[PDB]
Design a protein around this ligand. Structure first.
Ligand code: SAM
Ligand code: ZN
Ligand code: ZN
Ligand code: ZN
Lengths: 86, 98, 222, 97, 110, 103, 82, 109, 95
DNA sequence: CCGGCACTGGAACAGGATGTATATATCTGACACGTGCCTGGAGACTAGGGAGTAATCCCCTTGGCGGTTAAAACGCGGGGGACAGCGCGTACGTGCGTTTAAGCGGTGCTAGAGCTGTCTACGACCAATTGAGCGGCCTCGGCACCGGGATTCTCCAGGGGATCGGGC
DNA sequence: GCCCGATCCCCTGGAGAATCCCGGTGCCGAGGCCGCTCAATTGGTCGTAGACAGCTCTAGCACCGCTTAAACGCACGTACGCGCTGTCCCCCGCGTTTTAACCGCCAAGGGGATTACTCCCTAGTCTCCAGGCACGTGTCAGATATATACATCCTGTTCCAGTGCCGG
């Protein structure tokens, strides 16, 4: 049962990682309160998709999550993705 | 006197360096440890394919990069050049998420 | 000059005479507020009352504040005080006995309802005998208030370019009425007076014999 | 007269469920159309999602196990928790009696 | 036939037609075969969602001293419920209107 | 000779806050029917000539047009307030439509 | 018999009413010619699809179901007309 | 089977499989019956739509002096044409990137 | 074991060699064109289905396929594709 | 009081250091061809029902007229709000030095996904028969308006009385 | 000093009012009541889809060690939010007069919507055979790595306009 629980893993999205994502979007100057809000915006998007992927995985009576469960879960919300099968 | 470039130059010249590349801009191990921790709430003792975690990072980065482009127009509307935590909420509210 | 002016038939409300009726509506076209049983004064004088801000009178059966709501001042009639004192050459005027605050309900303006044509034939009649009528007030289209034959003590007022009250228009139970409110608080002992914008069809035949700095003007200019 | 053909709706079951919750109110002739559209519009989502769940898995039958997953994908958080109980009890009361 | 007939709504305990849901499933191009407890499960879910809306619409019509539901009470019922509003987000209801709401920076200040 | 008095008029912004309260409570349609019905018949004359309409098909377009406009005028307001104003200008409709997706 | 001038039958008071039901307090003077251009690109997108659905069925009358289908195709469902 | 077998997609002058489009239409729960000129019509449209997203990417590759096509040229080809940008408007393409674009108020005066 | 996986690779590669004779393509891009074709096939099929249902018919024909294209494709694409199809169907019959 | 030995910001302009683009060399790993074989497509009949075509019936979309009243257009005025110019001070950007985990080579272990083979219970198909549900036709009957007698309250009234200035 | 015919604060025969209340007339919508037909229940026969029970063998999880690229503090000074004050012009609340939407009629005819009869086009079985998939293999395009050669940003050092305020 090598399942030692994980904790406090959202602070692994460091602030340089966020400054690069903002540079690719065209931003010149950044405030100092943005780093604690980008994380809350991301942790709400990831759950809506992992929920549906696990729901698709249980219906087939499997234990491994595959790369088609994620594609179906994404397409169900209007976010089609080309490149990973289908 | 070590030549001290002025504020706003080094930023403007990597805005256009990161708009010619196509790589991924987050660390793989820190991103993979968070996916396995969010999904301990819905069912325990799961296993992930190697390429099912590479499909989530792309959707995530494509979501954030396009939220920042909407945030950058509200600031110019209000006649600023910096982005604040009140320009994200207007974009999300007008899009129709919150 | 110890005499008393021609008496007037004292009255409490307006009595219709002309060709227009009243617009008492049913209790489904009356607006509702947003207050509730709460701190000391509901619908008070210093409060965020949506019915008060927009110049509405609230009903005791529809107001959620219940029956202790302070937005009922056209029925309770807590009017002003001591009656006519003698002026010098103005007609009769009035005066206050009790101290009054800033922005408080002074007495209403009340009379009889006459329309355009009846009013104009009335003035064309009373002109040929030189009565010098001094009592007219329009409120909206096809309606006039008159206080000549009958009325109340608010018929004894004057005009000044430094007044203390104005005539606003409140909507009471589906109908619109007139009420005089004080600009600023004053200790008792002053003659109440308010500005009115005349619209004489003839010409201005009176100077402002009141006395102030800018008050020279006329009875029809600014 | 040509004796025009018949046309079906849920307007006698919608009017039977109302007499259980509010035994005294009535409903209007134009408020009945909206409930018709509501029922016909929620039928199709739940049918069309199970139609695809069965095709991803290479089956050719729709059972009472695809309808329990279409509901868990389509309805929100606390709504999708009483519907499952309703539907699970109405099959136990039927397969035995 | 030899015995007396009983419906299939009567066996399950429902008010909706379990026999009419079945032929709509069979004649709609959804699959090649259809089980036996699929309509019995899909009717008990369409009845719950109807009761859920009609209760709130009646509670909202009561507060006008009215005894009859009209299309305004259906809108007021669903725009106030945080989950029916998420289920019916992109839907227009004819003759419904809007919800009263004024912003705080527009109210008059002294 | 004899004049008429006149009570003070309303301060600006009161007869515009009474209508915000009156129109957010009715349900009727806010456009005139013959004016709206001639526009629909001249727009459709560029796709196919000499066609007819149903009285309940012309009444279904007017219910969706107003639901579109009333819901765009609510996004314009929040941009106007973001910029610290009270007035809505023609450059707030464009920002609303661009963030929303239609342009 | 061709038509024209018909876009100016959507007057200025009819736009101020639609703004009051939305909740606005002041209105600039250039909004009125800006709204008649937005209302006229939404109606064409729907009437084109309605006329296509009508011509597929060999009719000459536009019914009330053509409009409902052409609206549902764009994610604007409408209850109460069929 | 006396005569020599002549494929159905050579009778029409196409390159996509008219014989397999039919099997996919029949096993896909779309209707009860399927006509005979339906696959000959659908293959001729699937073939035209794909011979124009490639003619733009082949042009975009020649600007880097390259010989092959990669996921970046398909993105540069799709987001620069306002018809394919209207058809593929809610699609993400893996390893594609963005377009070079920078507002004017941010440039140094 | 290793049963079979079908795709469109060998027809996409035949179409490429008519617009660009001296050009190739890689795997990451073949795997994007494949998803493209599979995605458009299923938007055009699932609307002819609904049209036939609305009109109370049992058969899908080229007259349904032609109308499902004008509702899906925008602008000039819908005018060039409609002319592409009605030449293949005209050549096929006369043979 | 404007001109004057010598005075002060303003303007320009090369000229460094740093960052960005070249021209060869080397070199690995994946793209583009061939070969053998199995399964899915094509050729030739045959039997039944879905759709094309003609015909009749009546509903409902279009067109013109008169008339009454509520909404749209036009012109005055006056106070409030949008837009610009200053000034102060707090927070974000640029660079340098020190610390901490991501990443790249392996290695070994086992869990679980995919394929193969029997075998029984479940859904489609068909026939005979009865009641659940839709269309058309009466009743009652809870509301909106009009009398009406008309009940608490008001009020116009010339009069019932305590007062007075002289009357006596 | 007593007292007389007027003389002003109460006072009630009517009368009148408004409108609490109780009750006549008249309605557009909804609720129940019989004929009627077609769609759902009962009862059997049968053959394919799905449920267990092995059995091979790929790939996802766990550990170890090292080299270096990225994250983390820390300090300085500079441009950029944010508040304040003054001004002027455009959008709101009023009255008048002009225009056309709404409502009630009546008239004529296109086209939607059933119902019947007869081909002709799609499904369903056998055969036969060739196009497309997996496996194996070689060579060349694109990815680094050097070295040199410029473009690009920031400032010190000169140089005209106008002259600091002195002054006869
Ligand atoms: C308003 S009427 C009232 C009747 C009576 N004179 C009174 O004061 O009670 C007063 C008349 O006196 C005139 N008046 C009142 N106050 C005045 C003033 N302050 N200056 C000039 N005339 C005045 C007005 O012209 C008006 O006609
Ligand atoms: Zn209040
Ligand atoms: Zn109150
Ligand atoms: Zn004066």
């Amino acid at each position: 049962r090598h399942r030692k629980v994980l904790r406090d893993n959202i602070q692994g999205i460091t602030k340089p990682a966020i400054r690069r994502l903002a540079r690719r979007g065209g931003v010149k100057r950044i405030s100092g309160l943005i780093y604690e809000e980008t994380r809350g915006v991301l942790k709400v998007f990831l759950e809506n998709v992992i929920r549906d992927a696990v729901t698709y995985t249980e219906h087939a009576k499997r234990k491994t999550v595959t790369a088609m469960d994620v594609v179906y879960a994404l397409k169900r919300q209007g976010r089609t993705l080309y490149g990973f099968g289908g | 006197k070590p030549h001290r470039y002025r504020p706003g130059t080094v930023a403007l010249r990597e805005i256009r360096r990161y708009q010619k590349s196509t790589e991924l801009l987050i660390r793989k191990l820190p991103f993979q440890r968070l996916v396995r921790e969010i999904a301990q709430d819905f069912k325990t003792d799961l296993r992930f394919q190697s390429s099912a975690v590479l499909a989530l990072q792309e959707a995530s980065e494509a979501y954030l990069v396009g939220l920042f482009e909407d945030t950058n127009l509200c600031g110019i509307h209000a006649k600023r050049v910096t982005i604040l935590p009140k320009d994200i909420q207007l974009a999300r509210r007008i899009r129709g998420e919150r | 000059n110890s005499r008393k002016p021609p008496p007037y038939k004292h009255i409490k409300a307006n009595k219709v005479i002309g060709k227009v009726q009243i617009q008492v509506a049913d209790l489904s076209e009356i607006p509702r507020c947003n207050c509730k049983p709460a701190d000391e004064n509901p619908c008070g004088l210093e409060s965020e009352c949506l019915n008060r801000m927009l110049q509405y009178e609230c009903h005791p059966q529809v107001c959620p504040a219940g029956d202790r709501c302070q937005n009922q001042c056209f029925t309770k009639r807590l009017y002003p005080d001591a009656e006519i004192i003698k002026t010098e050459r103005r007609g009769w005027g009035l005066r206050t006995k009790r101290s009054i605050k800033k922005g408080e309900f002074v007495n209403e303006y009340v009379g009889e309802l006459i329309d355009k044509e009846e009013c104009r034939l009335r003035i064309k009649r009373a002109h040929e005998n030189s009565v010098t009528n001094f009592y007219m007030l329009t409120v909206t289209k096809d309606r006039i208030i008159d206080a000549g034959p009958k009325g109340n003590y608010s018929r004894f007022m004057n005009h000044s370019c430094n007044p203390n009250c104005e005539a606003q228009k409140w909507t009471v139970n589906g109908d619109v009425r007139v009420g005089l409110f004080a600009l600023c608080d004053i200790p008792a002992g002053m003659e109440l007076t308010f500005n009115y914008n005349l619209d004489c069809l003839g010409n201005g035949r009176t100077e402002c014999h009141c006395g102030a700095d800018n008050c020279s003007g006329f009875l029809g200019v600014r | 007269k040509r004796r025009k053909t018949r046309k079906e709706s849920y307007a006698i079951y919608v009017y039977k469920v109302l007499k259980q919750v509010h035994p005294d109110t009535g409903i209007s002739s134009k408020a009945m159309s909206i409930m018709n559209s509501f029922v016909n519009d929620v039928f199709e989502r739940i049918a069309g999602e199970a139609s695809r769940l069965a095709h991803y898995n290479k089956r050719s039958t729709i059972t009472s196990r695809e309808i329990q997953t279409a509901v868990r994908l389509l309805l929100p958080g606390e709504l999708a928790k009483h519907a499952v109980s309703e539907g699970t009890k109405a099959v136990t009361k039927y397969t035995s009696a | 036939t030899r015995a007396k007939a009983k419906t299939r709504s009567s066996r399950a305990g429902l008010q909706f037609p379990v026999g009419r849901v079945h032929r709509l499933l069979r004649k709609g191009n959804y699959a090649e075969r259809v089980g036996a407890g699929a309509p019995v499960y899909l009717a008990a879910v369409l009845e719950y969602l109807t009761a859920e809306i009609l209760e709130l619409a009646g509670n909202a019509a009561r507060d006008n001293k009215k005894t009859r539901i009209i299309p305004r009470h259906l809108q007021l019922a669903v725009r106030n419920d945080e989950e029916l509003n998420k289920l019916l987000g992109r839907v227009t209801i004819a003759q419904g209107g809007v919800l009263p709401n004024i912003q705080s920076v527009l109210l008059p200040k002294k």
